[PDB]
Hints:
Four copies of one chain form a homotetramer. Chain A is an alpha/beta fold. Chain A has two domains: 1-251 and 442-476, Aldehyde Dehydrogenase, Chain A, domain 1; 252-441, Aldehyde Dehydrogenase, Chain A, domain 2, CATH 3.40.309.10. Chain A is built from 13 helices and 22 strands. Chain A has a seven-stranded mixed sheet with strand order 14-15-16-13-12-17-18, sandwiched between helices. In chain A, strand 3 and strand 4 (32-37) form a beta hairpin. Strand 18 of chain C pairs parallel with strand 20 of chain D. The PDB classes it as oxidoreductase. Keywords: succinate semialdehyde dehydrogenase, Structural Genomics, Seattle Structural Genomics Center for Infectious Disease. It forms a tetrameric assembly.
Amino acid sequence: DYAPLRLYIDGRFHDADGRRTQPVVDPGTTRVLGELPHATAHDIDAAVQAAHRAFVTWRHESPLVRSDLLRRAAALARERAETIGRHITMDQGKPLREAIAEVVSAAEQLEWHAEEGRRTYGRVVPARSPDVMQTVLREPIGVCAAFSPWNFPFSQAMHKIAAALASGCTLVLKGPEESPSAIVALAQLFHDAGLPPGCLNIVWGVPGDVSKQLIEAPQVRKISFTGSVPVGKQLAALAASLMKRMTMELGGHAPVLVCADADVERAAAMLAAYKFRNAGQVCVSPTRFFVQRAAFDRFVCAYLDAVGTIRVGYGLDAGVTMGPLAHARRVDEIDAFVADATAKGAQIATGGMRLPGPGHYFAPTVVLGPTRDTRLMNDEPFGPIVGIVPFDDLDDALAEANRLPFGLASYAFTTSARNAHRISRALEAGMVNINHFGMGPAEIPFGGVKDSGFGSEGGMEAFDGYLVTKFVTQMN
Amino acid sequence: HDYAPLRLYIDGRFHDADGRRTQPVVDPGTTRVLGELPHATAHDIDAAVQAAHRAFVTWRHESPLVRSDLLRRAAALARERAETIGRHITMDQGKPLREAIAEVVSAAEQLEWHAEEGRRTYGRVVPARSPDVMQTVLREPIGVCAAFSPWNFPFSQAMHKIAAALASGCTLVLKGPEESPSAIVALAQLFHDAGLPPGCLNIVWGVPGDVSKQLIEAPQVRKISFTGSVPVGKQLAALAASLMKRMTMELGGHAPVLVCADADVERAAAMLAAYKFRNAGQVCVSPTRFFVQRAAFDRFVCAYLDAVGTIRVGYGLDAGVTMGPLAHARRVDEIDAFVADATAKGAQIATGGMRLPGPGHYFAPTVVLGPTRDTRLMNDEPFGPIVGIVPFDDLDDALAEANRLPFGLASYAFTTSARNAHRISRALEAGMVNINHFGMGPAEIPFGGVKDSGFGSEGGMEAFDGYLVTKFVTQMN
Amino acid sequence: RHDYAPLRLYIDGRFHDADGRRTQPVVDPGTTRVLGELPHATAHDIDAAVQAAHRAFVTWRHESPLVRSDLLRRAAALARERAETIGRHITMDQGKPLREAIAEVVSAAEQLEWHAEEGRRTYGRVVPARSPDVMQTVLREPIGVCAAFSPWNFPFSQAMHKIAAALASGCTLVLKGPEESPSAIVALAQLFHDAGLPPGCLNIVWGVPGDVSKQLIEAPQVRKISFTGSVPVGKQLAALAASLMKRMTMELGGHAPVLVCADADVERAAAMLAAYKFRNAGQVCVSPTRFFVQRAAFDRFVCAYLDAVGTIRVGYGLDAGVTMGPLAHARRVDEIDAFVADATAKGAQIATGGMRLPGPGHYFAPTVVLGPTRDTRLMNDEPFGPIVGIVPFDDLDDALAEANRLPFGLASYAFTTSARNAHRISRALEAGMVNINHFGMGPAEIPFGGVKDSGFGSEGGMEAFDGYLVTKFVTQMN
Amino acid sequence: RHDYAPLRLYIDGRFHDADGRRTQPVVDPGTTRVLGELPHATAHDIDAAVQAAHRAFVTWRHESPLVRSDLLRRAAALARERAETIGRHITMDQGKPLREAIAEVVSAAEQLEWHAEEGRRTYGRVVPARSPDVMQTVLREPIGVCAAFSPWNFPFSQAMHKIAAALASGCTLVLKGPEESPSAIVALAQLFHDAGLPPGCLNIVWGVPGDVSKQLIEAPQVRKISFTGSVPVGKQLAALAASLMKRMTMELGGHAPVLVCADADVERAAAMLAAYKFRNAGQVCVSPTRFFVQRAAFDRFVCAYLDAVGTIRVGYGLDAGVTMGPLAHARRVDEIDAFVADATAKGAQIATGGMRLPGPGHYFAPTVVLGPTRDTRLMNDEPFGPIVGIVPFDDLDDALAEANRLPFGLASYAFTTSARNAHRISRALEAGMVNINHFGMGPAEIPFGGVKDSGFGSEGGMEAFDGYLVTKFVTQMN
């Protein structure tokens, strides 16, 4: 009921024979699903060399031929969404419907990059002399190394693959060892779409060892990392020390500003359903809720009522809308957030404890009035917990929204043009969502500021980290 | 007397040393001391960062046309003061007066381009999937910047940092070159005289490693811009990245030149000789490795040596001098070592190759024939008045040799063939490819490198990329 | 005469007077005194202007964009230095208050400086090719000799648009400005002359407007037309230009709707809309004309609007304290009278104004008409004068439908605090420009233009050169 | 299968047979046999199509660009699936060899898919404001109902240009394709219908072309016209459109010059130019027509060109091995005869061809004319047929001046190994498209259009939507 786990190097799958493996466990049952083969150091060298060899011709392939191939892969992902999503549910925990939506979203991302790869436009700059021609070209940088995490194992990786391939680069990818089936399926569908050997390689191992070896590989010219801020800082320093380009999607700590003039009940119902998708294990998860005092009670009552409709359970079961957390350590982490909040006077309005059974189930948790020195209001919980505090002055709430070094997503609800304008300009965040959640579209750029990373994924900006600028000036 | 007072500039006020440590500034052509440069204290640098942050709060919101007017005023003053600023540059850096003045004028054009470009930091409206949704991609100034710029073009390298920071709506703490500082003082003076609000531009001095460490580690500093050597760039980039701070870098190059058999060979040789020995070859884009198609090799060399022979080495303020001394004694030692290494490995020194007489750091224009692939000259950036010229047979082999080094800033090619021009420009791994001329001057084009040569661009439309953050705003109405 | 500058033609770098030419009197609309005689170009003069523009274009198209910019910025600086003198003559031959004429010059200097900057940025595109030996470039190149026609309401800044756009794109220009308010155009020729613009790049001609425009449009060297004026004249000239496959851009009239939502700062909107409306006595292509005020705010808006209108001082444009001058000519006074009578005949109330003022000058009182019906001229035809109509509305979508009912579509205005109202109104309006809570069409860096009968193309902004550049696709296999 | 498909109108999502309407026979140009009867739209049919397109636009303009793209890509996939049948019918009613007809369908599918992608990217601009409380956006919005007219030379892909650009921009369309080769348009209606395109978005009509085009252009709801056809008809339609202030784009005739430099790969150029020239029997808007070959390469080029022309096989377009079919109609045979007669009467040499070929159909021999003078029709009028003129040149600047002498300016071609030649030629040519050493105007991602009499606006590329979008400047103070 769970697919075989493989490596994929230079157009060929590889199994465990002669390799170390690591068990893969279902977070909803704690049972072993399969064993994941680790790349050797030689495997990783072979993958870099194959990616370098593939890049020599792939960079020159027609952008339409490359588009055709990427679209064929996206079509296969859509055909296989139920099977791929089911394995994601098994090795990551999220409800099946969420896993399938992730596959579809990843297919749209891949298709957008196919379209955008035809549009890596250069610029002609009017010259000071009529015998001179000035062009600014954009060209693929070369072999890329990417590392992607477990919270959206299929779509996070698709970002790395879609951006590298559609820009004309090639890629060695180390996806999440703990939720690996999504990555194997990506290799499978790119293989089935006819992607030339070496263009896409997937490897596994001890993450620090794999990432160190990939970053120090001389043929690797650009790194892309999605993960935690402290690991991001370590890999970025190493990459920078070798003058290697990097783009980073790190954690966030999203503030929510609910103005007194908002549709308060509407905001509460939307934010409850959105918060507990993927059990809050979302880089953009709304976490710090600042609700104008006159609306606080109305919002909190509406929020708790909507949270009360959530059904926690095993992700393949009918009607389950929230699964377990990804591992036992996440349960302990939320426990510590809850304990820290209560010690400092906060009220646990609902949830706050683990749920019974084997497997890492935790109740959706709502914390009222957590102070500014609680962990909840400072450290990214990445889990099914929110803090809701009143505010009086909008500028004070904005200053609090900007106090943390995080700056990924942010949210606001208001009917006022002036409020919307002031909030959106004053927020220090890569993304500002007003009255809805609009970060899904592949055609918009997704990225952060401050500790939340560098660069963007999706949109027109998608290839910026993958292309070099070349100024060519010619006198005739 | 003939050299201006050297000062710090913090939060709109100039500071003399008043008890601070100083460092002598030496004229490289006479070795005489010109003046004393005051070092910023740790407290001075903190005050500059805090001043830049207070200034950023309002300057970020100032009208782009008001900011443009002010930056243009500063550029007009630079043009008015070009001779005086240029003379002092010759004195504390070495280059001939005509080059120093041309550097100032070029920096004024760069400043004006940025004034114009600051009005054009356009956002994007992305058509939404629903008619009640508005999707905008905004570009906003990142915040306080720290910049470090070197001595080879002390005025225009620094102007790049100032123009890009200020015109994007950021503010700046700048550490220019202690060994050639008058240009930086003049920059502070003219932005001050143009009425730039206090805190927007601050200039500091000190022990370079200590100052840069403090600036990068200052929490309010959000972005770094460095022009200098590759190893220092790698050290500072690693420090900045560990703090998740954005960086752009203009590092060294090792520019190859491909002279095809079908080129105007004599025209190429004369142009490349005059261009190479500008600033005594102390130029990040300086043509260094000459690959000349075998059949054109002898014709090119004779024409190159004839042109090299017309260069007049002397003191930069003296009439008719077209090459000055090197910037410091250590540069003479460095070129000596390149020459010795080439000779030991069998290369021919066609002209030059020795230091020139006199007090000051004078060195003869040096042309090395047939240096092998393991000579320092063909691997390490000499950044001085020396070239190597080797024959090639197959153009693709020459291109691989051009791309072999981790450097990738400038590159040059001379050909009349449309096919050669296309194949060369596509195959070169370089941020800039110059074909049949030297065209990296215009403020409206992007200047930058690949691989070890750095990342990001200065000038052109790309000038603000490191200074703006992307903000996606999506609103349901 | 003594306080008014000499009127001249300007052809191939030389000024020409009336020797051998027919002339036309130039009249001060505030006094009816004759200011001077305007020389008419002969047919041969116009031929010479077109030939000179063509010879100039041959080299001007290849001049460095930075050299062209330097020159254009010098001309702009001269405009700033001469603003008081140029403005005084504009007031004399056009009628508007001195402060308005000087502000017009300063605005035109900014527009010209913007085009100097934008001329360096007529970027082409490199399109990634299907084969690595192919190079695909999309170039933008100047189209050639342009002919332009600009009106009297902003004689200096409307003409500046034609000159700045043509010159900064690499084109050259034969311009026919307004014979009724001509000194601004002569001053434009003088400052481009003084800045060193090469001969032939800019030529100014005068004459019988229909005859001059016919000859210019039919000149084979002329490749592109640009016209600002009335819709019916634009349609005649556009049809002639199109019959010869010549490119055109057009800035025609508008009939601007204003939507005042109930949640607006009503008093602020009324005060702003009153001062803005009667600038240049409403002789403004974007002039707010049809005011749709949500019923609950109607009385409050009207009371504040009438109060603000009451502070306007009508008089001669050079006199201290005058904030509205006379209309441009006697036929304008007759036209506004006919609007007033037509509204009165159909049941509307004249809340203030509604009559002509004494004196030989073409003075008319600022006029506010309440409740004019859908079949009044005021709610259908562009009045281009000191008159507005104000009606209540209940449902915003009905107001939007009325705002869109006319074939005009230049400017439009709205006042609201609601994000939804602002979004719904801005998307639903059929207009080239939507101003919400303020009047923001001034900046040189934004595109100014209309839809439907109000024309096509834009002036200013990134779009300024679109009508002046041709696309050239170059594809090369190596 | 030798069947020919039913010819129908398509209005508001439903097909119509003739049902007593006037009809017109459709004739196979290779056999002269009647293939079927084409129904003409009545005036009421045309009114209904305009009204249906207007209703449809109300919701189509607000549809998600991704939903619209999905639908257009489904239509493209159906075109690819049906390519053999659609292509066979094109050969039957237009004449071109089957392999050309199929390639036209595939090329049109690529054009449709590109527009699907580009419709997601009709980006607006945010202009940095002078005050922090102001928001300035430049939006691009679909103009409304479009009317389009497309010709017979590429009946499927010319019409696809009109359909793809209108629909993908958010507009709707009433299309009048070529009555003489109508099956391709019916096939287009069928596949957009089969893809689920909402009713009214695409309507196809037929009739007397001047009457249909007059009625569509004068329909009030029609806001924009797009025409591909001849220069004189384009000028007639453009003047009518301009008189009503309606936006227009035009792809008219060309007269392509070819500059063959002495340093070219001459034999490669001759062989490529021969095969490209006689595609669609030269009935191509970009067809290479005037060949200027540097004197030193002239003999080599002509000899190699004649050899390649000699390999062309003329016959019925469905027959095996045929590489050129008949001309589209008898009137084309008369026209080419007149070009040949004028050339010989003025002293040129007919090196090959020059006569009609046997049989009932409009077959004509590939014709190469040597040394036609500047006063021959061949060097001045677009022949649009299987004929070229070849003259030597000595000075490259004189060849460029001759290449630019005509008011035509669509495509142009050059062959050289010199970077200087390529640069000087590509900059000096007055043409919308310059092809150097190959023919590179096929890609959907590049802009296709002309200058001077050859039209204005572009199809394909990023520019594809420029005629279909209005600019809206929104400035909001908060």
